[PDB]
Amino acid sequence: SSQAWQPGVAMPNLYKMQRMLLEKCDLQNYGDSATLPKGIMMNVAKYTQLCQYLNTLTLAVPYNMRVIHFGAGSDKGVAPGTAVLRQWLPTGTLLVDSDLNDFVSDADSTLIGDCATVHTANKWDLIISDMYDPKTKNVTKENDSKEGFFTYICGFIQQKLALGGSVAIKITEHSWNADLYKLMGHFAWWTAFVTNVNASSSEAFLIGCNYLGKPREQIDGYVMHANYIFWRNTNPIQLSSYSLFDMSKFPLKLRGTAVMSLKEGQINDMILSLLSKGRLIIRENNRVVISSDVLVNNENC
Amino acid sequence: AFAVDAAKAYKDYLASGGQPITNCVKMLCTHTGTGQAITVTPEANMDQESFGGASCCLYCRCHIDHPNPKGFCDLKGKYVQIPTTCANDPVGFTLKNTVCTVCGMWKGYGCSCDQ
Ligand SMILES: CSC[C@H]1O[C@@H](n2cnc3c(N)ncnc32)[C@H](O)[C@@H]1O
Ligand SMILES: [Zn+2]
Ligand SMILES: [Zn+2]
Numbered sequence: 516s517s518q519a520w521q522p523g524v525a526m527p528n529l530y531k532m533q534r535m536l537l538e539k540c541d542l543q544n545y546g547d548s549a550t551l552p553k554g555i556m557m558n559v560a561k562y563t564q565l566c567q568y569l570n571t572l573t574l575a576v577p578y579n580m581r582v583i584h585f586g587a588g589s590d591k592g593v594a595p596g597t598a599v600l601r602q603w604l605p606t607g608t609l610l611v612d613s614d615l616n617d618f619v620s621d622a623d624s625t626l627i628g629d630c631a632t633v634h635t636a637n638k639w640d641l642i643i644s645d646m647y648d649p650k651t652k653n654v655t656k657e658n659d660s661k662e663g664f665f666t667y668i669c670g671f672i673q674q675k676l677a678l679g680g681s682v683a684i685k686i687t688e689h690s691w692n693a694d695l696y697k698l699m700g701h702f703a704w705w706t707a708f709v710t711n712v713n714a715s716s717s718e719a720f721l722i723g724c725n726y727l728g729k730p731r732e733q734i735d736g737y738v739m740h741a742n743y744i745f746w747r748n749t750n751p752i753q754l755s756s757y758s759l760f761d762m763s764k765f766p767l768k769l770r771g772t773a774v775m776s777l778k779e780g781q782i783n784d785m786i787l788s789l790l791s792k793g794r795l796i797i798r799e800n801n802r803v804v805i806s807s808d809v810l811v812n813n814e815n816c
Numbered sequence: 817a818f819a820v821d822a823a824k825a826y827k828d829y830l831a832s833g834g835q836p837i838t839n840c841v842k843m844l845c846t847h848t849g850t851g852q853a854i855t856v857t858p859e860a861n862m863d864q865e866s867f868g869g870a871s872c873c874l875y876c877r878c879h880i881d882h883p884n885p886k887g888f889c890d891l892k893g894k895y896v897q898i899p900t901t902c903a904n905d906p907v908g909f910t911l912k913n914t915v916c917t918v919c920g921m922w923k924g925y926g927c928s929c930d931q
């Protein structure tokens with residue numbers, strides 16, 4: 516439909532309310548490819564549409580914003596997604612990215628290593644993950660909730676995402692986690708967003724909008740992933756790169772959202788209401804300090 | 817008194833007909849920007865492409881030290897504008913050309929301070 520002129524398609528609310536069984540994902544336009552603007556990489560186009568969609572939500576955008584980006588490398592040794600995030604985010608936003616393999620980045624700081632080795636002293640206003648292991652695309656194995664880096668991401672959100680902050684975590688048919696879905700119930704709102712340039716893939720970004728630090732709804736993660744696949748299975752999405760040609764409104768508006776440090780007891784319903792509206796961030800405003808754990812080994816006989 | 821001269825290496829490599837460094841990260845943008853050379857956000861005009869700075873820096877891409885004495889990089893974390901007629905080789909372009917310290921345009925590719 517009119518969907519082709521959007522940056523992508525978000526999961527309709529009706530599918531979220533179903534109780535489907537997990538089936539295999541069979542996409543009708545499987546193998547199709549979007550025609551990309553001359554010389555533009557798939558990941559630039561994919562991150563641009565993700566960012567164009569995030570512009571429509573109620574993200575908190577404070578001064579001194581802090582954004583962490585996992586899975587930022589590429590097989591090309593560069594970081595296309597980081598470059599789009601830095602273009603999108605207000606100038607001066609602290610941008611940290613990370614990947615298992617080495618790459619050169621425009622981020623303010625890059626950590627190379629498994630994401631479970633990454634620790635941060637400070638909390639974050641936005642977490643982006645494009646972590647993905649292609650060995651999960653095994654159609655001969657049962658499709659179970661995966662752990663690995665998804666287990667890291669769940670703990671990382673609960674321990675280091677500021678109240679009011681948001682996340683976008685890439686998933687696929689086979690690359691998913693039941694607890695992450697359940698954690699979407701801890702945001703004021705959530706969806707699974709599919710970019711129009713990659714609509715032939717079962718990829719989506721699991722988006723949690725304005726983190727509340729507690730269950731707002733109770734979500735069964737296995738059922739919810741089955742709902743998502745059921746949506747993908749019955750709603751062919753027309754590949755489109757139309758939105759990439761309209762960059763006039765792309766940059767994220769620096770809203771100067773308020774940041775307050777608050778203790779657990781002080782979070783009343785008035786606070787929660789502001790958190791839900793993207794009008795408040797709760798965290799310390801201290802220094803951004805990060806590290807990566809390094810395992811030491813002496814291989815000498 | 818020995819350090820490697822990667823800049824010379826790449827120039828000689830190009831001159832011999834070497835395929836320019838690929839996978840420079842080109843950005844989507846309006847192409848209605850100021851056209852200055854190195855900016856905090858994409859600034860291509862109608863005759864330029866905008867690229868992720870790091871991906872266009874020879875030193876970054878080769879995993880070698882920067883010639884800056886404190887090791888600082890001019891391009892990483894910014895966006896470089898490249899004339900579309902040179903966008904096949906953004907690394908070569910940024911190496912071989914120079915930014916006017918007065919107006920911020922590429923000398924010979926936007927700088928009009930000699931009029
Ligand atoms: C953009 S393609 C997906 C990226 O995610 C990265 N990735 C996958 N698993 C992990 C992990 N456990 N920790 C860090 N990066 C990862 C891969 O190295 C690849 O660059
Ligand atoms: Zn550099
Ligand atoms: Zn000049």
